[PDB]
Amino acid sequence: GLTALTMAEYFRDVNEQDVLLFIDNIFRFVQAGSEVSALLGRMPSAVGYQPTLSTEMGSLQERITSTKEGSITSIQAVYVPADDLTDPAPATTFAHLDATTVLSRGLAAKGIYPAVDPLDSTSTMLQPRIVGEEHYEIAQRVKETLQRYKELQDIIAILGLDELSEEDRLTVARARKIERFLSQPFFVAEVFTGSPGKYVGLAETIRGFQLILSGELDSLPEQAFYLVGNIDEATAKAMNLEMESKL
């Protein structure tokens, strides 16, 4: 890990680049440290880890920063031992994490790659002061719509969409379209999915979600938003799905 961090710090410092340092399972870094301390004979810390757990972790995490030159951003895979977030490997890993993306087998199976869970993913950046009041409120409204959909899935399973209230039906349709619009074709997954892949900045993101969330894009199918970016492409796919009907 320190070898990788040195190779990344060169690119940051000397070339003034924005570096993306990918760590593999950072649990195995902590585990290898616990191994070398058990070998050197030191007395273990609480749940069996090395006594130098917090300092060993900090000596790594304190060089993934942003200087006046560039910025190293790290995306670290985190394994939770015994699935508890209170174990000293997650308890000290999470003292250095800024955001969190959970990848969901549900979305991976139902075809909504990238399979990031929208509700179990967090970020300390998603605050008004940091991202703008508009961005914050649209993100909160999308989370509320998805949460209402997840709460209403069982009710629509029992009764049906024709038996819900009008506002709840409108919510269910909007959330369906939103869940399908979170998906995106990748420049890398292009080679087997075939779709040419898209890059979608944040401005077009919030502007497409504002439209799909207000009552402007309500007269469109669900599969017109699926696997596109840049909501104008969603309207183009919609026009194609309507050409299939006028034909």
């Binding site: 508890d84 174990d87 709840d168």
Partner: protein, 322 residues
């Protein structure tokens, strides 16, 4: 073996949560089916009440003198109670039996010679274990309440009345008006108005606010009920019906249909209300088992870390002692 029994307790709490949410969902399905049953049994009673209103208007000047509309003011009383068949009921059967205790406590005072017909299972179990109460018949929910239970009840109460042994057969049931709350009502049954309107325990025509055809719709993301006033009723017109039977014997052959329809409607309402109480009780139990599972998982993680710590500290203490 303390950690393993903790793991097993947590697993049993997970099983309890899964089965309580299954019970909640199947109770919601059965509420929807009871609502379907009510809306399918509606039009029969609609045509019946319009026919009977017209015929009574054709008979108010007449000498109808049917035992069912007749008033025997010597006032014996026959309270009847429907209760929940199955169990856990939220607080359905408790409130029902409690209002029964209230009514009999008011009645045995006045000397009106009360008596009880119990229809539900929790009700009749309560009544046999509390033998200080006179009782007339027992019924159960093994037999379907859709046709045969209510038809047997109508037979028993009809033969109770026309053999003029008792007056004032009144019913205690619980109309499904809301998910979390369902207050029981006492409606009189047999000393019925010739117009054909269901009354209250005193008789001040509570058919006005009956709010037919409850239905289930969500409000914002959670299921509620919505109950309106008047639907698909055409009672006004009555052509020349040119009766073939006797004008009083027409009502004599008709009114048992009103008795059966009212008993069946009350059974369907109390069934839907019992299932709604069960749904809300199982929702509460699922939420409580959820927070219990969370607390158990926290305590177990703490115990596991403490066990690992103590074990390794003991091992290293022994090694350093060597």
């Amino acid at each position: 073996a303390n950690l393993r029994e903790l793991r097993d307790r947590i697993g049993s709490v997970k099983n309890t949560q899964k089965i309580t949410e299954a019970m909640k969902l199947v109770a919601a399905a059965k509420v929807r089916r009871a609502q379907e049953a009510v809306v399918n049994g509606r039009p029969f009673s609609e045509t019946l009440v319009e026919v009977l209103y017209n015929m009574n208007e054709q008979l108010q000047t007449e000498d109808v003198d049917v035992p069912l509309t007749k008033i025997r003011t010597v006032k014996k009383v026959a309270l009847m109670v429907v209760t929940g068949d199955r169990g856990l009921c939220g607080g359905f059967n408790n409130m029902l039996l409690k209002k029964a205790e209230s009514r009999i406590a008011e009645l045995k005072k006045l000397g009106v010679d009360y008596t009880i017909i119990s229809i539900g299972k929790k009700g009749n179990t309560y009544f046999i274990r509390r033998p200080e109460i006179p009782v007339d018949r027992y019924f159960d929910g093994t037999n379907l309440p859709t046709a045969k239970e209510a038809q047997a009840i109508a037979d028993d109460v009809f033969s109770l009345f026309v053999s003029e042994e008792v007056d004032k057969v009144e019913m205690l049931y619980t109309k499904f008006v809301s998910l979390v709350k369902s207050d029981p009502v006492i409606h009189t049954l047999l000393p019925l108005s010739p117009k054909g309107e269901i009354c209250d325990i005193n008789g001040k025509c509570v058919d006005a606010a009956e709010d037919e055809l409850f239905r289930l719709t969500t409000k914002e993301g959670k299921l509620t009920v919505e109950r309106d006033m008047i639907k698909t009723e055409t009672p006004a017109f009555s052509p020349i019906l040119e009766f073939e039977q006797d004008p009083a014997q027409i009502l004599d052959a008709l009114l048992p249909l009103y008795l059966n329809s009212q008993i069946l409607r009350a059974l369907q309402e109390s069934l839907a209300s019992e299932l709604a109480a069960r749904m809300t009780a199982m929702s509460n139990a699922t939420d409580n088992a959820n927070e219990l599972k969370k607390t158990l998982s926290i305590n177990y993680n703490r115990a596991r870390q403490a066990k690992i710590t103590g074990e390794i500290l003991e091992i290293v203490a022994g090694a350093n002692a060597c």
